[PDB]
Amino acid sequence: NFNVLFSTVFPPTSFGPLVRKIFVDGVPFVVSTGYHFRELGVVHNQDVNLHSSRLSFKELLVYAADPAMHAASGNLLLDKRTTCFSVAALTNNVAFQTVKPGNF
Amino acid sequence: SKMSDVKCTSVVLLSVLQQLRVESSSKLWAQCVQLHNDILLAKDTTEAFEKMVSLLSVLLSMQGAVDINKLCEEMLDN
Amino acid sequence: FSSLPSYAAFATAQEAYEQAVANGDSEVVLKKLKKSLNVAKSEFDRDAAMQRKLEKMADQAMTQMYKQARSEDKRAKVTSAMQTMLFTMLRKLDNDALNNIINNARDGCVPLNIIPLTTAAKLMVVIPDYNTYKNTCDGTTFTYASALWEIQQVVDADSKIVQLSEISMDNSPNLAWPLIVTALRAN
Amino acid sequence: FSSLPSYAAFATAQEAYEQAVANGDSEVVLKKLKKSLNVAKSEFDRDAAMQRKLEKMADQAMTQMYKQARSEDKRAKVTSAMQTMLFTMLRKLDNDALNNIINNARDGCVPLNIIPLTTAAKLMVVIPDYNTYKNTCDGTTFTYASALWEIQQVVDADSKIVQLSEISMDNSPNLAWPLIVTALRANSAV
RNA sequence: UGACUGCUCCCUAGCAUGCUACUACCG
RNA sequence: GCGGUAGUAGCAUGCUAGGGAGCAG
């Protein structure tokens, strides 16, 4: 309850996942190893290994669901259609989706 | 009975327009969608008819598209 | 189910046993006849239901394949079906403005943009022959879609302005005919 | 179903018993015939039932092992696809600006929302109307996020090229307005 | 491009249980 | 003479599995 009130002062770009650089067989990655909540404060992961050999299936699944790599390997985006915070654009084009009528 | 008929005709007309790759032009598709959504919400049967004329003008002003004359000689529209 | 050898055997056994019993006889003959009859009766009775289940199952399978074929056929003629249906409903509506514009488009006078509804905004049509001009445009007013419009500009295929007084019966056939009238909606 | 181990004995006993019956012998041979054939059919019964149970069990086992093998093959291919995607997206990290801002951190951790803001090479802007356009990206170079960007291309909602000479107040109502502007970082990254 | 739950109807396949029936063995 | 057992057929009951569809938040 107190954190909710106090979090409205600090800048909005300091909230969310916290990333760092890890090495897998000499190549560098970018993965999320914590979070900064507006309500729960700062949370750090408990099992993080920087240097590791070739990764398994569940590590692939975890690293493929993290938004860290997708956001870090994308272009900057400034969207004026909405007033919500924007992070990045994953492609070079914007997709517009329509809805079709029914059948009689 | 003269209002549900025009709503069904508007639905069919929008389907036909969508089949002709009209949504590849954002302005025309937006206008067509607005007209179609406005017809279905009508309460009196004069505004619906003028909007129906406006919507049918979109299909009529496309030269290649369809054959008005063949589709009028099949014991269809006069 | 009277087309199987089991039916024939069961029928012959039934007839023989019935005749022997009706003639009147002892116990051992009846016992032997029924012991030779019941096996054939069971043989008949099994197939009597197996054939029925096979026949109904075959009928259901043919039904399902017909339905699949018909659905696959139907989902491949949608454009023509929808166009024919739309023009049928447009017939059934029976409105004067819609009929006017449909006949005009059928004879060659189609618009170039969306027909406006306000007391303002421009409308452009194409008039390909003198007869259509005679029917629609008379004077300085324009009648289209069961409304009234006021001509303000005439443009030819060569994009040169043509004044209204120029167009006449014999004075026309020296012109680029696909004219383009631009009018506004009269009050 | 016709060459079972007990089939030979059953058929031979049936043939011999029926030959004895056709010989028209006494009732004792008939009773022996009946008993022998009854026990022969009784012993043939389980030999005809257990085999049919076993075949269906074996078929079910084969089907289950086949589907297990197919599942393993699918797992292998999805693993390969995920590895390829990760290693392909790795190759665009711009490993000098990222390293420059990582080393400035006091322990190696930085917020994710400021990585594209300080290391990206391209910027995309979506503009609703002309009033917003003339306040954000007017001209050929503009400033955003404490950096200088220069325009490279402008397209519309239909993905067709639009030149800056026709983005004006008079010509505004003739464009598919959700315009997308692409720029490059000047003097820094691209 | 197609989220998380809940309920209901239809068709097929298997399993378990019960009812009846037909032969056979045993006492 | 009665019961038990072993197959076979029809019928009914409840679950599991697969497919098609409908409604509600």
CA distance B78 to B71: 9
| D126: chain B residues, CB-CB within 8 Å | none
Q: In B, residues 19-78, which contact D (CB 8 Å cutoff)?
A: 24-27
CA distance A30 to A73: 10
Cβ-based contacts with strand E at under 7 Å: C 34-35, 38-39, 42, 60; D 34-35, 38-39, 41-42
Of all nucleotides in the shown strands, which has a C1' nearest the CA of C45? F9
Of D131, D136, D128, nearest in space to D169 by CA: D131
Q: Do chains D and C touch (3 or more CB pairs under 8 A)?
A: no
| B27: chain D residues, CB-CB within 8 Å | 176
Of C101, A101, C95, C145, nearest in space to B8 by CA: A101
Query: Domain limits of chain B?
Result: 1-78
| D157: chain B residues, CB-CB within 8 Å | 26
Token pair of C41 as six digits: 């009766």
B18 near C CB under 8 A: no
C151 near B CB under 8 A: no
CA distance D9 to B76: 82
- CA D158 / C1′ F23 distance in Å: 40
Tokens 């078929």: give the residue: D59
The 8-class DSSP code of residue D161 comes to B
- CA A104 / C1′ F22 distance in Å: 19
Long-range (24+ apart) CB contacts under 8 A made by D175-179 are D176/B26, D176/B27, D177/D127, D177/D128, D177/D129, D177/D130, D178/A81, D178/A94, D178/A96, D178/B26, D178/D126, D178/D127, D178/D128, D179/D126, D179/D127, D179/D133, D179/D154, D179/D155
N-term to C-term CA, chain C: 84
Tell me if A70 and D122 make a contact (CB, 8 A cut-off): no
Token pair of D84 as six digits: 């390829």
Point out the residue among A98, A101, A103 whose CB comes nearest to the CB of B36.
Answer: A101
CA distance C102 to B68: 8
Q: Is C114 helix (H, G, I), strand (E, B) or coil?
A: coil
- List Cα–Cα distances, D144 to A77, D98, D148, in angstroms: 11, 20, 7
Point out the residue among D89, D112, D132 whose CB comes nearest to the CB of A80.
Answer: D132
D81 near A CB under 8 A: no
CA angle A76, A78, A81 (to 5 degrees): 145
CA distance C185 to C145: 11
In sequence order, which residues have a C-beta less than 8 Å from that of residue C51 and are 6 or more positions away?
Answer: C1, C4
In this structure, the strands spanning C122-127 and D148-155 are unpaired
CA closest to C1' of E24 belongs to: D38
State the smallest CA–CA distance between residue B29 and chain A in angstroms: 10
- CA C64 / C1′ E10 distance in Å: 14
Q: Is the CB of C57 under 7 A from strand F?
A: no
In this structure, the strands spanning A51-52 and A16-24 are parallel
Q: Which residues pair with D161 in a beta bridge?
A: D155
Tell me if A103 and B15 make a contact (CB, 8 A cut-off): yes
Elucidation method: cryo-EM
Tokens 């937006």: give the residue: B30
Of B3, B62, D184, nearest in space to A92 by CA: D184
Of all nucleotides in the shown strands, which has a C1' nearest the CA of C64? E11
The 8-class DSSP code of residue C186 comes to -
Token pair of D120 as six digits: 């990206």
Tell me if D128 and A78 make a contact (CB, 8 A cut-off): no
Helix axes C78-93, B4-19, angle to 10 degrees: 150
Q: What are the backbone angles phi and psi of residue D187, rounded to the nearest 5°?
A: 65, -5
Q: How many CB pairs under 8 A join A and B?
A: 17
| D120: chain A residues, CB-CB within 8 Å | 74-76, 88
- Resolution of this PDB entry, in A? 2.9
CA distance C111 to A46: 71
Q: Which chains touch B (3 or more CB pairs under 8 A)?
A: A, C, D
In sequence order, which residues have a C-beta less than 8 Å from that of residue D87 and are 6 or more positions away?
Answer: none
Can you list the alpha helix ranges (DSSP code H) found in C75-139? Answer: 78-93, 96-107, 130-136
Q: What are the backbone angles phi and psi of residue A28, rounded to the nearest 5°?
A: -90, 135
Tokens 């004067």: give the residue: C96
Closest B-chain CA to A101: B15
Tokens 């007990």: give the residue: D6
Name the fold adopted by C97-186: Alpha-Beta Plaits (3.30.70)
Of all nucleotides in the shown strands, which has a C1' nearest the CA of C57? E12
C77 near B CB under 8 A: no
Q: Which residues of C44-74 are buried (b: 16+ CB within 10 A; e: fewer)?
A: beeeeeeeeeeeeeeeeeeeeeeeeeeeeee
Interface test with D, best of B26, B29, B31 (most D CBs within 10 A): B26
Token pair of B27 as six digits: 């302005």
Protein-nucleic contacts, chain D 6-45 to strand F, CB < 7 Å: 42, 45
| A101: chain B residues, CB-CB within 8 Å | 11, 14-15, 18, 36
Point out the residue among B11, B15, B23 whose CB comes nearest to the CB of A98.
Answer: B23
Tell me if A104 and B8 make a contact (CB, 8 A cut-off): yes
Token pair of A43 as six digits: 């949370």
- CA A98 / C1′ F7 distance in Å: 67
Q: Which residues of D123-162 are buried (b: 16+ CB within 10 A; e: fewer)?
A: bbbbbeebebbeeebeeeebeeeebebebeebbebeeeeb
